[PDB]
From a paper:
pmcPhospholipase C-β (PLCβ) enzymes cleave phosphatidylinositol 4,5-bisphosphate ( PIP2 ) into inositoltriphosphate ( IP3 ) and diacylglycerol ( DAG ). Their activity is controlled by G protein–coupled receptors (GPCRs) through direct interaction with G proteins. PLCβs are cytoplasmic enzymes that must access the membrane where their substrate PIP2 resides in the inner leaflet. They contain a catalytic core, a proximal C-terminal domain (CTD) with autoinhibitory activity, and a distal CTD with structural homology to a bin-amphiphysin-Rvs domain important for membrane binding. In this study, we demonstrate that Gβγ activates PLCβ by recruiting it to the membrane where its substrate PIP2 resides and by orienting its active site.
We next determined the structure of PLCβ3 in aqueous solution using cryo-EM. The autoinhibitory Hα2′ element in the proximal CTD was also resolved, bound to the catalytic core between the Y domain and the C2 domain, as proposed by Lyon and colleagues but not the distal CTD. We also obtained several low-resolution reconstructions with varying levels of density corresponding to the catalytic core and distal CTD with differing arrangements between the two domains. The catalytic core resolved by cryo-EM is very similar to the crystal structure with a Cα rmsd of 0.6 Å if the Hα2′ helix is excluded. We attempted to determine a structure of PLCβ3 in complex with Gβγ in solution, in the presence or absence of detergent, without success.
Author numbering: 12 to 92, 97 to 470, 574 to 850, 867 to 881
Write the structure that this text describes.
């Protein structure tokens, strides 16, 4: 039921806006249009050149009172400064939550900005628009070329030369072949640059012997075409998924297989005889029908009824910072970016107020950073708590205010800002008695829970907390922190609404010492882990180390995107970006038990066996440089193999072909926790793209994988071509041993 991106009628034609820059302090009058496929937001600016904004890279559009107000008096004199409030709209785009740009537009009509903001936020955060197929990204590149015209309304050659900048001579060679004007400028009329000419230009620019090898291997030892039984047997032999059932996902019939030939083959002579040439099969391999993940993977199809303790929750740590821990600058924008990305547990370190006024502020503990006040932070959390996923957001207070007047001021702020969302009273079905589990995420849709006390040197400043008052301890009902004594002692206590906060090193000690008791603890209560205090440059531990034993709130640092943050943002993308993933069956049922450090297969869990072979790649860069591709697998410490690599291609960043043996992962013990990680690098270590695929729902056969950038935003051109084969498994000093097992996962 996930819709395709549909551009409404009032955006295809476009309205008028008054784009104002705060820096240049200027006024222009532009017209905002969205192209009919839903790819760009383009406008003809003052310099007669069409500016474009990629609509997939929009983080937030905010209008009304949340929009940016001008602080230059002369630009308010220009705009004439309360109906003038709601005619504002700002668009927030960028490649990571830190380095965001702003685009300010003021409408000229009456009540258009609300419709424009809502339609742009719907077109940006779409699910099927992000997980598209390969042909859609090629058409996205074509629409990018068709929009950006010059002052004479033609397409200059320099845009085509800046697109495929990994060569020169083949570009004008193929343009001379296809019948195009190759020159310095050449002023190409857009009528003679339709989509078929673009497809001919790409097919004569990049020759594909790999698809010729695939056509050689799938039974076309006769040259030209494919018959119905050959194409049907290719699909039903290679492209199946043998883990599923043959009665729920039925095999392909020729009556359904004729529609693919009627849809993809361009040649009318092969079509009447029901055949498929090479030019049609190459179009088939990147369509809607043959993707890398099925559409059930990203749809909100997870059973959201289980207790809250059975859910990996996307969390953050020191969300106010934007740089290193010591001398950073605190900012309120990072709360909005974290909540709009999909984080659900943010942090607040509150401090006491000054003599002359009274206000608590948020900053790091005496390391000489900046200061933001608490009211703006709570307003930003109230604004962007449910703009992306209607599911409960846990606030994590780290209180330091010792003057109870300011504590009652903070409690009154929290009550007056949020409203009905804040969980001020416990629920009817679930009381706070020893014996009853936590509520469900479905029961708390749209609510906000706080985490405060209710009446060391490595932990940072989060160990000298202050005791509560009778005002701020009313709000703490379901998630209340408590000091951790033992596992059997906190298991005989049987109070499910407790939770404990660890530091990274104490959690590593508890994981190496007694893992089964840690898993049995995590079936009932919540447990949050934050990184240590030694990390002054905002590094990240690998969160799989604590996802293995069922920790729910594994807090990370959102400012820097290393491999840990890449894995976190990649694995919480599924389940509709809701921020909640379900734990597997053997870590939330109280009768089953298993060791997380096992090395043989676990009874009652069906193992898998995966085999990945990289074939080729396309348009991976914009310069002559080599390319190599990495394949890693995270998971349980028996499954984690992150050594594999391919040989470096020579100077082919345009169509390199690798040719070696596949990478075998022949015994995956717990398959519904492993996460395959394909990544491509230039020679020397420059990052190109990566892609996170879970092993529980990856397809088999030849597929196109479209790489993403560091913050999981879809790149247009670069795309690998892999061949995977998933199948069911057919069988043929202690602390030293635990650290030896954890070495490859730590890295
Ligand atoms: Ca903190």
């Amino acid at each position: 039921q996930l819709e395709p991106p549909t551009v409404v009628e009032t955006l295809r034609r476009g309205s008028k806006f008054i784009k104002w820059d705060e820096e240049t302090s200027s006024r222009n009058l532009v017209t905002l249009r969205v192209d009919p496929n839903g790819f760009f937001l383009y406008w003809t600016g003052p310099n007669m050149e069409v500016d474009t904004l990629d609509i997939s890279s929009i983080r937030d559009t905010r209008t009304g009172r949340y929009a940016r107000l001008p602080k230059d008096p002369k630009i308010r004199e220009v705009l004439g400064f309360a109906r003038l409030e709601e005619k504002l709209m700002t668009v927030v785009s960028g490649p990571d939550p830190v380095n965001t740009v702003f685009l300010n537009f003021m409408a000229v009509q009456d009540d258009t900005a609300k419709v424009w903001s809502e339609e742009l936020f719907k077109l940006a955060m779409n699910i099927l628009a992000q997980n598209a197929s390969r042909n859609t990204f090629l058409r996205k590149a074509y629409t990018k070329l068709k929009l950006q015209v010059n002052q004479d309304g033609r397409i200059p050659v320099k845009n085509i030369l800046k697109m495929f900048s990994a060569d020169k001579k083949r570009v004008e060679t193929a343009l001379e072949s296809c019948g195009l004007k190759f020159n310095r400028s050449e002023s190409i009329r857009p009528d003679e640059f339709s989509l078929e000419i673009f497809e001919r230009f790409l097919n004569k620019l990049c020759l594909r012997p790999d698809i010729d090898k695939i056509l050689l291997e799938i039974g076309a030892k006769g040259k030209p075409y494919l018959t119905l039984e050959q194409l049907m047997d290719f699909i039903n032999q290679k492209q199946r998924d043998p883990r599923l059932n043959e009665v729920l996902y039925p095999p392909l019939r020729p009556s359904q297989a004729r529609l693919l030939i009627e849809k993809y083959e361009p040649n009318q002579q092969f079509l009447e005889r029901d055949q498929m040439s090479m030019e049609g099969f190459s179009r088939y391999l990147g369509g809607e029908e043959n993707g890398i993940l099925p559409l059930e993977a990203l749809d909100l199809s997870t059973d959201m009824t289980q207790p809250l303790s059975a859910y990996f929750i996307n969390s953050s740590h020191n969300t106010y910072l934007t740089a290193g821990q010591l001398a950073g600058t605190s900012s309120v924008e990072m709360y909005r970016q974290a909540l709009l990305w999909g984080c659900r547990c943010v942090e607040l370190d509150v401090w006491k107020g000054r003599p002359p006024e009274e206000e608590p502020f948020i900053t790091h503990g005496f390391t000489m950073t900046t200061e933001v006040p608490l009211r703006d932070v709570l307003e930003a959390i109230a604004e962007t708590a449910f703009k992306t996923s209607p599911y409960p957001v846990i606030l994590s207070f780290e209180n330091h205010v010792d003057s109870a007047k300011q504590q009652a001021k903070m409690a009154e702020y929290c009550r007056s800002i949020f409203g009905d969302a804040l969980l001020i009273e416990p629920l009817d079905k679930y009381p706070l008695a020893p014996g009853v589990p936590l509520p469900s995420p479905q029961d708390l849709m749209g609510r906000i829970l706080v985490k405060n006390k209710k009446r060391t040197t490595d932990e940072g400043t989060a160990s000298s907390e202050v005791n509560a008052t009778e005002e701020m301890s009313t709000l703490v009902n379901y998630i209340e922190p408590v000091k951790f004594k033992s596992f059997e002692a906190a298991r005989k206590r049987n109070k499910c609404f407790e939770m404990s906060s660890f530091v990274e090193t104490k959690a590593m000690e508890q994981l190496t010492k007694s893992p089964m008791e840690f898993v049995e603890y995590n079936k009932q209560q919540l447990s949050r882990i934050y990184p240590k205090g030694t990390r002054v440059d905002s590094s990240n531990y690998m969160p799989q180390l604590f996802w293995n034993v069922g920790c729910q709130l594994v807090a990370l640092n959102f400012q820097t995107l290393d491999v840990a943050m890449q894995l976190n943002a990649g694995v919480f993308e599924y389940n509709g970006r809701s921020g909640y993933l379900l734990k597997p069956e053997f870590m939330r049922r109280p009768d089953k038990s298993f060791d997380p450090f096992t090395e043989v297969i676990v009874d009652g869990i069906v193992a898998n066996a995966l085999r990945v072979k990289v074939i080729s790649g396309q348009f991976l860069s914009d310069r002559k440089v080599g390319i190599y591709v990495e394949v890693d697998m995270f998971g349980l410490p028996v499954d984690t193999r992150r050594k594999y690599r391919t040989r470096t291609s020579q100077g082919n960043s345009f169509n390199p072909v690798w040719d070696e043996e596949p990478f075998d992962f022949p015994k995956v013990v717990l398959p519904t926790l492993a996460s395959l990680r394909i990544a491509a690098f230039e020679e020397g270590g420059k990052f190109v793209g990566h892609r996170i695929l879970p092993v529980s729902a990856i397809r088999s056969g030849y597929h196109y994988v479209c790489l993403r950038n560091e913050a999981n935003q879809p790149l247009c051109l670069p795309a690998l071509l892999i061949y995977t084969e998933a199948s069911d498994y057919i069988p043929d000093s202690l602390m030293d041993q635990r650290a030896r097992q954890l070495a490859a996962l730590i890295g």
